[PDB]
């Protein structure tokens, strides 16, 4: 979608492997603010939104 109508998707009831996002070189910017990128596999979340 365009930036004025940005698409928001809820993520819930799943086990997430974030290691495929860090180890992928396709992303020019992979920048996390309130959490370390390498600790994402060690934590549990709710209210996940993309």
């Amino acid at each position: 979608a365009s930036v004025y109508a940005w698409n928001r998707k809820r993520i819930s009831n799943c086990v997430a492997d974030y290691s495929v996002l860090y180890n992928s070189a396709s992303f020019s910017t992979f920048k996390c603010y309130g959490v370390s990128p390498t600790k994402l596999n060690d934590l549990c979340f709710t209210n996940v939104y993309a």
Partner: protein, 49 residues
């Protein structure tokens, strides 16, 4: 209220301990007041801050 002088000292000491324990719940401007949460969420360069 006959023994109020001793009870004041007991209440002051217990209240000082309760305030000192309560102060652990404050984050003081950090992201969290829990050290385990910070150590499990952040890399050491920002977890140090």
């Amino acid at each position: 209220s006959a023994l109020g002088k001793l009870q004041d000292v007991v209440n002051q000491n217990a209240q000082a301990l309760n305030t000192l324990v309560k102060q652990l719940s404050s984050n003081f401007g950090a992201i969290s007041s829990v050290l385990n949460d910070i150590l499990s969420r952040l890399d050491p360069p920002e977890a140090e801050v």
